[PDB]
Amino acid sequence: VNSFSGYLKLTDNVYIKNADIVEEAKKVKPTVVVNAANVYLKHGGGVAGALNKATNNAMQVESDDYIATNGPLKVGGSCVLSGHNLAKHCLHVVGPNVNKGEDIQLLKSAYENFNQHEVLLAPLLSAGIFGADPIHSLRVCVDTVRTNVYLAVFDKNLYDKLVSSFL
Ligand SMILES: O[C@H]1COC[C@@H]1Nc1ncnc2[nH]ccc12
């Protein structure tokens, strides 16, 4: 039993809700919140910009030190950093950005990072400003993630479409 509330159950391990991931994280304080990161951990917009803003830019400060030490992530890769005031940990995961020409096949590799954590609050990878089809992202999530994932979908219209089209 966990404290996630109001989710629709899609499969044995995947759950979904129309919610603002920032507000969800502040309420639940999950062990892991997933950020829709880029390889430079520049949290300018989308989910990343919103999560970083909610940390009063502390996420960005920590991320800049991480990059200065380690260099950029790989597309499809991840790193674990602090969750600040939102969660114990933030798993920064880089899905492919279609508006940069990146290979959508890397979306499966991106979701594989979730399997290193027993329970996660997450957005749909490569959705929103990353330019992928969110219906496809949900399909890859369900077919790749084996741990317990709670998906927050900000847009109500999109949430309803994802549920109604789910096979
Ligand atoms: O699938 C994501 C990528 O593009 C649009 C979607 N964005 C979001 N999803 C959940 N909570 C959110 N809070 C702020 C932005 C946001």
From Swiss-Prot:
<feature type="domain" description="Macro 1">
    <location>
        <begin position="1"/>
        <end position="167"/>
    </location>
</feature>
<comment type="function">
    <text>Responsible for the cleavages located at the N-terminus of the replicase polyprotein. Participates together with nsp4 in the assembly of virally-induced cytoplasmic double-membrane vesicles necessary for viral replication. Antagonizes innate immune induction of type I interferon by blocking the phosphorylation, dimerization and subsequent nuclear translocation of host IRF3. Also prevents host NF-kappa-B signaling. In addition, PL-PRO possesses a deubiquitinating/deISGylating activity and processes both 'Lys-48'- and 'Lys-63'-linked polyubiquitin chains from cellular substrates.</text>
</comment>
<comment type="subunit">
    <text>May form homohexamers. Interacts with N protein.</text>
</comment>
<protein>
    <recommendedName>
        <fullName>Papain-like protease nsp3</fullName>
    </recommendedName>
</protein>
